[PDB]
Design a protein around this motif. Structure first.
Motif, PDB file in Angstrom:
ATOM      1  N   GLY A   3       0.864  -1.168   0.000  1.00 17.47           N
ATOM      2  CA  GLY A   3       0.000   0.000   0.000  1.00 17.47           C
ATOM      3  C   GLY A   3       0.909   1.228   0.000  1.00 17.47           C
ATOM      4  O   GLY A   3       1.957   1.196  -0.644  1.00 17.47           O
ATOM      5  N   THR A   4       0.546   2.283   0.733  1.00 14.97           N
ATOM      6  CA  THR A   4       1.421   3.402   1.070  1.00 14.97           C
ATOM      7  C   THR A   4       0.705   4.372   2.015  1.00 14.97           C
ATOM      8  O   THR A   4       1.238   4.726   3.067  1.00 14.97           O
ATOM      9  CB  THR A   4       1.996   4.117  -0.175  1.00 14.97           C
ATOM     10  OG1 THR A   4       2.783   5.218   0.223  1.00 14.97           O
ATOM     11  CG2 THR A   4       0.949   4.603  -1.184  1.00 14.97           C
ATOM     12  N   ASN A  15      -3.701   7.126  11.734  1.00 20.44           N
ATOM     13  CA  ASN A  15      -4.729   6.083  11.713  1.00 20.44           C
ATOM     14  C   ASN A  15      -4.176   4.706  12.116  1.00 20.44           C
ATOM     15  O   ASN A  15      -4.245   4.334  13.284  1.00 20.44           O
ATOM     16  CB  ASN A  15      -5.501   6.066  10.375  1.00 20.44           C
ATOM     17  CG  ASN A  15      -4.609   6.125   9.139  1.00 20.44           C
ATOM     18  OD1 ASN A  15      -3.392   5.991   9.255  1.00 20.44           O
ATOM     19  ND2 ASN A  15      -5.182   6.298   7.954  1.00 20.44           N
ATOM     20  N   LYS A  16      -3.694   3.891  11.170  1.00 20.99           N
ATOM     21  CA  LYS A  16      -3.661   2.438  11.369  1.00 20.99           C
ATOM     22  C   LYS A  16      -2.464   1.921  12.180  1.00 20.99           C
ATOM     23  O   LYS A  16      -2.241   0.712  12.231  1.00 20.99           O
ATOM     24  CB  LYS A  16      -3.863   1.680  10.041  1.00 20.99           C
ATOM     25  CG  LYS A  16      -2.603   1.410   9.198  1.00 20.99           C
ATOM     26  CD  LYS A  16      -1.835   2.668   8.782  1.00 20.99           C
ATOM     27  CE  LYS A  16      -2.629   3.476   7.754  1.00 20.99           C
ATOM     28  NZ  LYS A  16      -1.960   4.749   7.440  1.00 20.99           N
ATOM     29  N   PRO A  23       2.204  -1.994  19.224  1.00 21.03           N
ATOM     30  CA  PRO A  23       3.065  -1.892  20.400  1.00 21.03           C
ATOM     31  C   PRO A  23       3.369  -0.492  20.956  1.00 21.03           C
ATOM     32  O   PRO A  23       3.169  -0.282  22.149  1.00 21.03           O
ATOM     33  CB  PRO A  23       4.319  -2.708  20.084  1.00 21.03           C
ATOM     34  CG  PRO A  23       3.743  -3.826  19.220  1.00 21.03           C
ATOM     35  CD  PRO A  23       2.662  -3.111  18.405  1.00 21.03           C
ATOM     36  N   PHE A  24       3.873   0.480  20.189  1.00 24.45           N
ATOM     37  CA  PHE A  24       4.209   0.481  18.772  1.00 24.45           C
ATOM     38  C   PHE A  24       5.727   0.581  18.626  1.00 24.45           C
ATOM     39  O   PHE A  24       6.372   1.307  19.381  1.00 24.45           O
ATOM     40  CB  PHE A  24       3.485   1.657  18.098  1.00 24.45           C
ATOM     41  CG  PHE A  24       3.417   2.955  18.892  1.00 24.45           C
ATOM     42  CD1 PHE A  24       4.554   3.773  19.050  1.00 24.45           C
ATOM     43  CD2 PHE A  24       2.206   3.333  19.503  1.00 24.45           C
ATOM     44  CE1 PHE A  24       4.470   4.974  19.775  1.00 24.45           C
ATOM     45  CE2 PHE A  24       2.118   4.542  20.215  1.00 24.45           C
ATOM     46  CZ  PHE A  24       3.249   5.366  20.347  1.00 24.45           C
ATOM     47  N   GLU A  25       6.305  -0.141  17.664  1.00 22.16           N
ATOM     48  CA  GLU A  25       7.734  -0.136  17.379  1.00 22.16           C
ATOM     49  C   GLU A  25       8.028   0.875  16.267  1.00 22.16           C
ATOM     50  O   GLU A  25       8.901   1.732  16.407  1.00 22.16           O
ATOM     51  CB  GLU A  25       8.235  -1.557  17.030  1.00 22.16           C
ATOM     52  CG  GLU A  25       7.187  -2.588  16.571  1.00 22.16           C
ATOM     53  CD  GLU A  25       6.487  -2.191  15.285  1.00 22.16           C
ATOM     54  OE1 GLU A  25       5.583  -1.333  15.387  1.00 22.16           O
ATOM     55  OE2 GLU A  25       6.878  -2.678  14.203  1.00 22.16           O
ATOM     56  N   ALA A  26       7.284   0.773  15.164  1.00 25.86           N
ATOM     57  CA  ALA A  26       7.561   1.459  13.914  1.00 25.86           C
ATOM     58  C   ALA A  26       7.817   2.962  14.069  1.00 25.86           C
ATOM     59  O   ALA A  26       8.801   3.449  13.511  1.00 25.86           O
ATOM     60  CB  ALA A  26       6.471   1.137  12.884  1.00 25.86           C
ATOM     61  N   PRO A  27       6.986   3.718  14.810  1.00 30.66           N
ATOM     62  CA  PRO A  27       7.165   5.152  14.989  1.00 30.66           C
ATOM     63  C   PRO A  27       8.575   5.561  15.419  1.00 30.66           C
ATOM     64  O   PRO A  27       9.053   6.613  15.002  1.00 30.66           O
ATOM     65  CB  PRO A  27       6.110   5.573  16.014  1.00 30.66           C
ATOM     66  CG  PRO A  27       4.988   4.579  15.727  1.00 30.66           C
ATOM     67  CD  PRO A  27       5.779   3.295  15.503  1.00 30.66           C
ATOM     68  N   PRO A  34       5.343   1.823   6.960  1.00 30.89           N
ATOM     69  CA  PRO A  34       5.592   0.434   7.342  1.00 30.89           C
ATOM     70  C   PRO A  34       4.303  -0.284   7.763  1.00 30.89           C
ATOM     71  O   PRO A  34       4.145  -1.486   7.555  1.00 30.89           O
ATOM     72  CB  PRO A  34       6.592   0.517   8.494  1.00 30.89           C
ATOM     73  CG  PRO A  34       6.242   1.845   9.156  1.00 30.89           C
ATOM     74  CD  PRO A  34       5.934   2.718   7.946  1.00 30.89           C
ATOM     75  N   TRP A  35       3.391   0.454   8.398  1.00 36.17           N
ATOM     76  CA  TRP A  35       2.153  -0.082   8.948  1.00 36.17           C
ATOM     77  C   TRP A  35       1.159  -0.414   7.832  1.00 36.17           C
ATOM     78  O   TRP A  35       0.481  -1.437   7.882  1.00 36.17           O
ATOM     79  CB  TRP A  35       1.540   0.897   9.971  1.00 36.17           C
ATOM     80  CG  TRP A  35       2.365   2.082  10.383  1.00 36.17           C
ATOM     81  CD1 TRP A  35       3.157   2.164  11.476  1.00 36.17           C
ATOM     82  CD2 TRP A  35       2.502   3.365   9.700  1.00 36.17           C
ATOM     83  NE1 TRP A  35       3.767   3.400  11.519  1.00 36.17           N
ATOM     84  CE2 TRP A  35       3.389   4.189  10.454  1.00 36.17           C
ATOM     85  CE3 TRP A  35       1.983   3.907   8.505  1.00 36.17           C
ATOM     86  CZ2 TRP A  35       3.721   5.492  10.059  1.00 36.17           C
ATOM     87  CZ3 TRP A  35       2.320   5.208   8.093  1.00 36.17           C
ATOM     88  CH2 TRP A  35       3.174   6.006   8.874  1.00 36.17           C
TER      89      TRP A  35
END
Length: 40
Positions: A3-4, A15-16, A23-27, A34-35
């Protein structure tokens, strides 16, 4: 990618994150796409 969402929804962290990357790890690492379906 996969997606993007990139442009949309008030910076697409907003949002998602909670949903897909809770967790969040990505931020901490990559506020990109990434999400949203990318996973990578």
């Amino acid at each position: 990618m996969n997606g993007t969402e990139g442009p949309n929804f008030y910076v697409p962290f907003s949002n998602k994150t909670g949903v897909v990357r809770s967790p969040f790890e990505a931020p901490q690492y990559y506020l990109a796409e990434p999400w949203e379906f990318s996973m990578l």
